[PDB]
Amino acid sequence: RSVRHIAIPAHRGLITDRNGEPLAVSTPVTTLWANPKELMTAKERWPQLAAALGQDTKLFADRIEQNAEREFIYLVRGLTPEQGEGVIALKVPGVYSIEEFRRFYPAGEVVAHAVGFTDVDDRGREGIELAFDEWLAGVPGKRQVLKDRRGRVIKDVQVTKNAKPGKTLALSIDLRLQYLAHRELRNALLENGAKAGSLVIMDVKTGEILAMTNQPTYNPNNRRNLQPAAMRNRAMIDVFEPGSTVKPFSMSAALASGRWKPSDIVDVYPGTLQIGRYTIRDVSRNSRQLDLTGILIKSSNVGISKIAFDIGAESIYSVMQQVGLGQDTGLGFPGERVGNLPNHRKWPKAETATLAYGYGLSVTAIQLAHAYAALANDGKSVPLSMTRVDRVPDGVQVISPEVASTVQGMLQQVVEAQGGVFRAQVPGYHAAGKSGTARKNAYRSLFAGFAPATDPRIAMVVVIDEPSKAGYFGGLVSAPVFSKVMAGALRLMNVPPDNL
Ligand SMILES: *C(=O)[C@@H](NC(=O)/C(=N\OC(C)(C)C(=O)O)c1csc(N)n1)[C@H](C)NC(=O)NS(=O)(=O)n1nc(C2=NC=C(O)C(=O)C2)n(CCCS(C)(=O)=O)c1=O
């Protein structure tokens, strides 16, 4: 006779979207265990027990003999109650069932990267499951038992500690927008023969992540083998050069300096600019005088570089750091990357120019979307959240409201003006944004923007990695994805059309 204490598993808390749609649900599973000391008295039952467990008779018999000095062995973990009851129905001495919890992900591949998953022990292993593990797990209980000399449970004496169930968690994700974003990103990858992609949707007023999808994705309900590339939450754990998508932040520094107005002109002829051994190069090289809006419409690296030389890189670095590029988001997502915003005590001319046009800095899609959200929210940055926000925290004014408003207007012209990124136009609304194309010849196609331009509600980033068709420019590849997903998101959120 021996007094022993055994655990009582806790029910893991439900994860829902922002409207209560289930995203991660704890399902009862049966764990079958056996006491090899008791099994030894019923050898004639072993072949039927092996057959029920789908094991070769001899391998099963060998396994029980090799573990003959033990009082506990796992037979099979995570069976369905129906399957466990079938083994229990054989009435084999020394065989026991135990109720365990296993996660089911009703939206499967659609929200796999954001939700993440639990391991074999029901502990958070990836995504939100890992980030909020303490909240979701609860606390296992403890049961007191009396065991005989073979280790067989003679009596259940008392519960010493009751199990405490885990707590419900409502994400910021809107499953309707998530499904729309998932489908359009998937379609774009196919249309462009692309390797990977990410799409982030943010509420500019609340800091909430309304959608976060990546390609390739995986079914978290069937994780048998399957590629590590498919499990990466790329929006948070992959870094890239943002390129021309950071030019609005360089422009914000220009307008805040007191030295530049949108109607000021920069001469970008002949479409290149030599700075020692380095040459700044424009894509289209048939311009001379461009105004500040024109520098963004034509995406002139030369133009933004000349502005950067005039105002100094310190002013540009400060805006980019303040909007969160290459900075910790504070989300604490597992494996989340910070990227890098290079710094210098004395900025050389080449580094000043490359900073201004987003070369040599590394950011995540989440960081880029957060920066555009600050710009869209009249220069005020609301802290990021992966959970439903009921009480909105105070934001930080990172760009002056007048400067943010002027840049917003310039970005609406990037989308709407003659020669602009027309594929980003959102039917029924005024939209604003900037595309980018980064050479990694392999490319990353980008679009970052927000809408409705008259009263912004949503910021969005579209990243398409290595499009393989003739078209690779961000304005061609990523801009139409932004248009479709933004139109859908605005409609789902009942945002009144502003292009009247
Ligand atoms: C910004 O992202 C800029 N990128 C770079 O300078 C980098 N690479 O440039 C390329 C050209 C890809 C290269 O060196 O091969 C870069 C930055 S960080 C890094 N590692 N590399 C470029 C200049 N800007 C854009 O791509 N802007 S954009 O996506 O809006 N875009 N530009 C164009 C073209 N404009 C003019 C031309 O003559 C062209 O041939 C392309 N486009 C396509 C037209 C779009 S439309 C019909 O006007 O809407 C586009 O989308």
Side-chain angles (χ1 to χ4, degrees), residues 83-376:
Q83 283 182 314
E85 263 99 81
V87 173
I88 291 302
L90 286 169
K91 310 178 181 172
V92 181
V95 174
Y96 303 98
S97 62
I98 258 174
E99 293 122 303
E100 243 173 22
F101 283 108
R102 180 200 171 143
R103 282 293 223 209
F104 180 64
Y105 300 101
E109 69 163 30
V110 177
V111 71
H113 300 123
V115 173
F117 58 86
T118 48
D119 54 31
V120 68
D121 294 312
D122 194 45
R123 279 109 97 263
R125 216 202 91 175
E126 290 230 45
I128 283 285
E129 287 275 40
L130 202 211
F132 288 83
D133 190 67
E134 183 171 299
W135 179 267
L136 297 162
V139 52
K142 214 146 195 189
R143 234 170 77 192
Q144 197 177 295
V145 74
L146 203 99
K147 291 182 24 278
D148 66 11
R149 230 262 205 273
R150 285 118 81 127
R152 183 247 299 171
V153 163
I154 332 174
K155 72 170 284 167
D156 289 353
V157 20
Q158 65 173 333
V159 171
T160 62
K161 193 184 186 76
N162 281 311
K164 204 169 208 171
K167 295 168 267 183
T168 301
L169 189 67
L171 300 189
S172 54
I173 300 298
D174 186 321
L175 189 55
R176 307 167 306 151
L177 268 67
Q178 182 75 17
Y179 187 68
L180 167 74
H182 168 85
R183 186 191 63 237
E184 297 303 328
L185 185 61
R186 182 176 188 267
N187 291 342
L189 244 88
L190 301 172
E191 191 175 335
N192 297 99
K195 171 219 179 76
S198 300
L199 198 160
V200 176
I201 306 174
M202 268 182 69
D203 188 306
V204 313
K205 292 174 173 300
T206 71
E208 289 169 304
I209 295 161
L210 298 177
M212 178 171 63
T213 178
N214 315 96
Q215 280 294 141
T217 185
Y218 65 104
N219 187 354
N221 295 308
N222 195 329
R223 301 186 313 271
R224 255 81 206 98
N225 308 109
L226 257 69
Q227 66 280 69
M231 299 189 285
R232 296 183 68 85
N233 181 10
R234 298 180 186 268
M236 299 194 149
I237 79 164
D238 279 34
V239 299
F240 60 87
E241 303 177 69
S244 309
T245 65
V246 304
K247 290 178 185 178
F249 303 108
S250 306
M251 197 59 62
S252 293
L255 298 175
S257 74
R259 298 180 59 79
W260 296 87
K261 58 176 175 52
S263 64
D264 279 338
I265 284 284
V266 176
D267 177 352
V268 304
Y269 174 90
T272 60
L273 182 60
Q274 201 73 26
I275 60 187
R277 286 188 243 96
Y278 187 84
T279 315
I280 299 154
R281 290 180 187 102
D282 282 359
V283 284
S284 182
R285 301 178 197 174
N286 286 355
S287 292
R288 174 165 277 143
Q289 293 186 359
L290 296 180
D291 63 18
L292 306 203
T293 306
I295 286 165
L296 295 182
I297 292 157
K298 300 273 191 197
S299 203
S300 168
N301 290 157
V302 171
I304 204 77
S305 294
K306 296 194 175 192
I307 291 165
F309 303 151
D310 180 75
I311 67 175
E314 293 84 350
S315 70
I316 298 168
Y317 173 92
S318 185
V319 177
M320 293 182 185
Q321 183 246 80
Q322 285 225 275
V323 302
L325 300 179
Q327 315 306 121
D328 195 319
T329 64
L331 284 175
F333 230 76
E336 187 180 9
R337 280 27 178 199
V338 173
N340 187 247
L341 186 60
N343 210 11
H344 297 88
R345 169 174 152 96
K346 180 188 112 72
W347 282 86
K349 228 183 164 179
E351 282 77 4
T352 298
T354 59
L355 170 73
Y357 57 86
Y359 179 89
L361 60 127
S362 319
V363 309
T364 65
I366 172 75
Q367 284 175 350
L368 192 59
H370 193 217
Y372 269 74
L375 181 59

Side-chain angles (χ1 to χ4, degrees), residues 241 244 283-284 299 301 420-421 423 434-439 473-475:
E241 303 177 69
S244 309
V283 284
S284 182
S299 203
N301 290 157
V421 186
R423 295 176 189 85
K434 180 67 186 82
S435 29
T437 314
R439 183 188 313 167
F473 282 97

Side-chain angles (χ1 to χ4, degrees), residues 457-468:
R457 292 286 305 281
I458 302 168
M460 186 182 301
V461 164
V462 177
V463 180
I464 290 155
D465 197 10
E466 297 189 40
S468 63

